[PDB]
Design a protein around this ligand. Structure first.
Ligand SMILES: COc1ccc(CNC(=O)N2CCN(c3ccc(C(C)=O)cc3)CC2)cn1
Length: 143
């Protein structure tokens, strides 16, 4: 009857580089973390918001992006593990997915960091409304 699985893809990533000169605060690095879809996909169809949970050392460390670009750009002096929550426009479970993102910086001398983490999300028997949103985003029905 109505069994199906819908797969969508998310790309998490970050860039970091050593500043030519530290900030007055002693911030050595510029970095950027993001969540995006692959080319020609619009994840905003199924994503309500992305929450980036910065290290307690940052002011207002809960950074919300309710629309693209889903990204945080900062200057700092150390990497950390960053919880990233991708909230879905889904009425039922699952409502979100959480990733533990390793935001690492390039130690002196080393080239800039430019990392990508590809995540495939499998939704089993999504609702009609949420299935609509997944497929509008470029999601694929399996079997
Ligand atoms: C102990 O382990 C760790 C691990 C990782 C870090 C990284 N943290 C930073 O790089 N920074 C945190 C502090 N920074 C700010 C401080 C103050 C302001 C205000 C008041 O506007 C803005 C920014 C940004 C850079 C730190 N400690």
């Amino acid at each position: 009857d109505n069994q199906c699985t819908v797969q969508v893809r998310l790309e998490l990533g970050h860039r970091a580089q050593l500043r030519k000169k530290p900030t007055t605060e002693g911030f050595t690095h510029d970095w950027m973390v993001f969540v995006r879809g692959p080319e020609q996909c619009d994840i905003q169809h199924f994503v309500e918001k992305v929450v980036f949970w910065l290290h307690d050392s940052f002011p207002k460390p809960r950074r919300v992006c309710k629309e693209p670009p889903y990204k945080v750009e900062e200057s700092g002096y150390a990497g950390f593990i960053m919880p990233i929550e991708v909230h879905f426009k889904n009425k039922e479970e699952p409502r979100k997915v959480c990733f533990t993102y390793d935001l690492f910086l390039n130690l002196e001398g080393n080239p800039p960091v430019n990392h990508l983490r590809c995540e495939k999300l499998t939704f089993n028997n999504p609702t009609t409304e949420f299935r609509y949103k997944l497929l509008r985003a470029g999601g694929v029905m399996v079997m």
